[PDB]
């Protein structure tokens, strides 16, 4: 794998990706936060192959957290074989065992929607260990369900953790400030106003005028939302995903195509973002159309 | 029987709590104003999202969920009927902070004297929160929430909910409620006013340093080092800047609202704070008396016992922004 | 495509959106035939009236990921990992890729959709369908064994707009699902043609639409408390007339007290007089 | 059965008209209204053949769950076996006889979480989704060989009561799947007055009491918020003690007022004994 | 091993470390409460070498509380064997038995993030026995899952317990005042002002001007943090761990390096910290960058 | 066991110990209700030896309640073998059996931290017999797990039950119903203003004036807490056990020793108590230092 292979279709600036990989080699843990629809899940698998430099899926594990996730499933816990219960090495514990076999090659763990599950409960012992200065046998810790003090679990140096956390919902956020320190937080923007996004549209038999019209439209819409940080922070601002996908058939992006998506997707969304103002909904919806 | 226009009171409470358009509402009375805040405040939260706190649950279920508690499992023999005692983390909006909002909404609904539109929206919201459990509110509940895990926004509505709960009295019917006549009583109005200024000063007077200062008598007693019998003395506010120190004592009296004899009993407290307070910096020592009046504001200055003291008033009921100018204008004069 | 009371354009919108996006939510009041639409609609898309492909479930507040996808539940011998319906269903479509298998989710609004779907909240998206996008599930013993949504599966979600819940709003899930409103369809002739081909009076049908629409507009007047989503559905009229009892003012009176009157209470809570007016208006 | 029931005949016919078509129904009324006695005779009235076997009765409570109701695992002598519940056993019983109507009585339905108890089946009991087409495999049915479907013949009657002010707004689950019918106490009705004239009651004693309770029922229901229409007292207390063999008398009422109505009045108000004293006194005379 | 060896690199004053040993040796159980990034974990492993006076790992045991610890895990619980359950002596019970093997040499048990778990449940019987007075055979007590034949468990005198409670997450705070009497609370400050932090920066090819600038800017921020108590109390104030790390390669400290720190870690931290007005965020980020 | 050994060292008045001994012989179910640091656990071991009149371990048994404590361990229950389930006599069952043999000699059972566990779950059926009037063979009952109804368990009249409850937590406002009926509460004052507390300090090389100054401050401080009811009740107030400890070496009392104690015990305790008013913390801390 190579760096340039990824960047062809990527809307995010390279400056950010170099910033991402710079931290990730340093901190060994990062969290990518942006609105829904900006390629967090998309980049993250790409980023792993850049960081490792080789397209090996065996070394990468990708999981999505949710409410029904606990330390027993993640790391260790007692679970039923059948008639008899057993201690079940969880997925992360197994992944770290794999990393120990091959110290040289970097192993990457990608956690989508990390902000959902109770991280303090899920990681637990790992909450300390995962930090860049605390990896290695010197900081070995016995786990909850370990038979004795001698059985101890230490994160390998090689492991890199990547977290994907949407900021659209304030309810589920990483408020645990101690844990916030372990993860180095890299915001991600929709990146409408970039060359790479336009080349994607322009290559798809698209009007050059319409593209600049569209980018000018959304950039203002995003900034309006970002202004009212009390009501809606910048994290809520609309992503580029609605506009990206749907053209694989070969449909050229005419003004009609934009008008179709807005009614189905953005229109109810704006009603949700602006519950109290019905007029304000009309203004921004009509602005795109006209 | 003159009092402050009710809308202006809400602003003093806001500073009192340390943290909107009221032109729309036509109900002048306080509960109409306050309910519109809460009723709209909850709606602002729901847009971003209400607090969801993982509540652990240890319960008897037909399977493995999270962590099984082996002891409760074998002791109750739950395995035999295909059940385990297992601990898991349900995610609810039923938190203590959230329950309080809902119970207060019932109180707002039950109030006999309230705008009809306001009650209509509130009754909708009470319906819109099915999962949350109604509660019988006491101050003890709010006491537990002083930890402040909740956001800066939640703490505002909870303060509103705290205010309503305390100022709720039964009215015509056993079920319904009637609002307290908050404005009439001096003690709560004064305690608002004293706290209103202290919190007001920290925000606006970025130039000066603002602290409430405990003071100790210059006395010595042959009997006791303690001096418990002597009155406890704590400044209302002290607003110290390098050029001048200043103590203010402010109180709400009904008698002063009358434009005759004048109520200045608070001044007796003030001098003794000036005397017992001794400045290391020795720049200067000044005092200010500020009271609320309705019609107009008059400022006087005095040189009493070697101290520079102000008697002043502010015309609450004028307009809230101009009032902000008037309050800062006063402090500028005397502080300098 | 014949007895449907919904416009042909909207179903034309739906089929294109469904085929392209692969997920949709049909959101409207109760009584607009969301379920009948979805059941009819699935059969159009499959091209055959196959009930085995189509599976319907009705979410409810206690529904959880243990039931839906994976879970530990007891057999006769003891405990085991029991593959829930969606894992079981996605396996079924995985066996036969070419045909289109459909999943209908009723009362979707009630449950905490993130909790139930969980891992598939990412996978369900049309681009993220395939082996490359697989993830190991929560209860999977080994990382190597993973779960991936197949490309053929299409999901249809039925949402009742009459229970707004100010509990959790997720704008990410809204991205996966393309939301389609459904209006009751009183104005549409197709609903009228059904009744006019059931020996209804020409005027009576015209009066009925006038009566209900005046009610519907009142409900949508105050968007904050109530809305277009709350407004009354038509379905109550469909049922109960295939016995042979032709429409009459007496028949409507039965339905109003039987069916519409509770609805009115819930919407116009603690306001009997407003109910009396709109209830009585219908009888006239 | 028609003559014995005290509720208006129009209501009795109305229920069958709703029940036959809708197939799911719930009766909400005050305690002492004969909700259970109504449903049984109404169940027999709907079948027309007075078979108790067809009817099966269940009382809900907060502990009641799917393991009892439908299917569950109970310990054997050693190990454990799947244990079929009431509704699963009941419906399979009706499955043989499609023509024959089978009824199920769910008492105090509002107490339990309908979802938790029924589970999967909660959609299947909605009349639109009934029969072989709407088969769903159940939670504990490990194999897919057999599926559970509630057949068309089954009708579900639920007994709910508006006694308690503690009750909040009814669960959303019920409202969708159930049609709510309110039962009046029925003092005014001729059928109740003809039940006391047959027992040699004085018409003045009869007529006064109908007027006397009605005066209470109006005031208790006059309250907007705490005590509504649902609270108002039922007639069941008046039945018990008359046709066993003991004739009506004024003192017989006095026993009955103290027995049930007097404490009941205290529970609803629970504030002022004087208000209780006046109304209880007026009942006596 | 001795104090001079340990305190070469520690940024904490000598004053506290002696204060720590004053309370610890008399009281035998302490808690180090400070914000994240102040070396609470760092010192605690080092303290173990001081009190024993020697670097042996066996006399030390380190664990972390993950809000899933229970009495079954810590002291006594039932664990599955192949077909049937057995009683397993927990980690602390295993440790105390080692501790009484030799009373002369002191034994340390270190519990990170003690604040999280419901401590009343975990310790249980030990909550009485941990205290300095209530140690030794005189206060022998029978445990819950003890054998029918009387066997009693007493915390030996030699054992010392050290806890590491961060003060950022307010909810996770010890409000069991019966329990808070067993432990002694030693606040640990951020450590900016001290020269011993500064000397660490200077030695790594750093200008003293920037170093003195850095501490000046940070201390201004922490006062703004410390002044509030409603949401951001004294405890939230920013730790020094961010600046410590990442300079091992030879990266000299400069505003270019500081710029990476502030944009990436601190600036997210601040916006979550305040989350009322963006202007306050823009102020403090620019102050550090300026 | 002569009273002379017992009662001098104790700070609690000889008046109140008499009252305690009255109710205990009369009612046999007694609860000492006081804040942490007032010697609840300290007296109870002594009181048992007072009543028996001798120092014998056999006649006295001590346990601490916690949430895991249950009937199946306390009284009777089934414990797994490698496979089988064997019934096992619990503590109270085994202890009373000892008491049956010697009816004349008084027997004591000491139950610390009783509020933590629900009594009903633990005692269960035995709360019926445990009451003072319902003792002796006439009221015998067959237990829940008894193989046959013939086997019966009655709490003999000789045993007296002592329960140590601390009113230091907000939850205890809803006191358990089970405790009040069957146990008789006794309140323990903190007891700064006591002659014996002073005499303990005076013998340990303490100035008389310094000691009395301290009592005036603490009595003033505790009085401040007693005024509140919403946040801090009377039971929250400071105990007298911080000051007793730490003088065993011979280190003389002084403001220096007090200064460590305030900084490491009472200052953070006040931070927890008075979160809402930070200055209120400062008001006392300097006052206590004074
Ligand atoms: N082809 C292409 N698609 C992109 C690009 N950037 C983002 N997308 C698309 O947008 C969709 C979502 O990516 P994703 O990371 O999951 O967005 P998200 O913010 O993580 N969503 P969520 O937060 O809800 O998980 C995919 O279709 C993804 O491929 C891009 O540069 N090229
Ligand atoms: N070299 C060196 N590193 C220090 C010093 N003080 C703190 N650190 C470093 O800062 C980082 C974190 O310290 P740590 O003890 O974990 O802080 P913490 O409070 O335990 N962290 P948390 O609250 O998140 O659990 C480590 O790299 C630690 O070694 C020091 O004096 N010298
Ligand atoms: N010498 C002496 N020590 C006392 C006296 N009163 C209390 N103490 C000491 O205070 C320390 C703790 O007493 P303790 O009874 O455990 O307090 P507690 O109420 O049990 N604590 P908690 O409520 O948290 O369980 C012991 O050293 C105890 O002896 C006393 O009068 N004299
Ligand atoms: N012919 C026809 N029948 C309909 C239509 N809409 C609903 N029905 C019938 O109305 C009955 C109830 O539909 P239901 O799914 O419960 O309503 P919904 O879920 O709220 O949409 C079923 O018989 C539906 O098929 C329609 O548009 N046309
Ligand atoms: N004989 C007879 N008894 C009736 C009639 N109506 C109600 N009852 C009696 O009242 C009792 C049932 O009352 P009910 O309200 O259901 O009791 P509840 O369920 O506890 O509220 C039984 O004795 C019924 O037979 C009736 O019309 N005739
Ligand atoms: Mg994603
Ligand atoms: Mg740590
Ligand atoms: Mg104790």
Author numbering:
A (entry chain C), E (entry chain B), F (entry chain A): 168 to 457
B (entry chain M): 3 to 21, 28 to 267, 272 to 348
C (entry chain D): 174 to 457
D (entry chain E): 173 to 457
Lines from the paper:
McrBC is an antiphage defense system of Escherichia coli that specifically cleaves invading DNA that are methylated. Furthermore, upon binding of the endonuclease McrC, a higher oligomeric form—tetradecamers of 12 McrB and 2 McrC protomers—is formed. Here we present the structure of the AAA+ domain of McrB in complex with McrC at 3.6 Å resolution using cryo-electron microscopy (cryo-EM), which reveals the coupling between the endonuclease and the motor and the mechanism of activation of the GTPase.
The complex was formed in the presence of the GTP analog 5’-guanylyl imidodiphosphate (GNP). Three-dimensional (3D) classification resulted in nine major classes with varying tilt angle, indicative of conformational plasticity. As the structure of one McrB hexamer–McrC monomer complex is identical to the other (see “Methods”), only one of them was analyzed. The McrBΔN protomers form a ring-like structure, with a pseudo six-fold symmetry. In the hexamer, three consecutive GNP-bound interfaces have a higher buried surface than the GDP-bound interfaces. The asymmetric hexamer and the consecutive arrangement of GNP- and GDP-bound interfaces indicated that hydrolysis of GTP occurs sequentially rather than in concerted or stochastic manner. These interactions change the conformation of L3. Our structure-based mechanism reveals that McrC activates McrB GTPase by remodeling its active site.
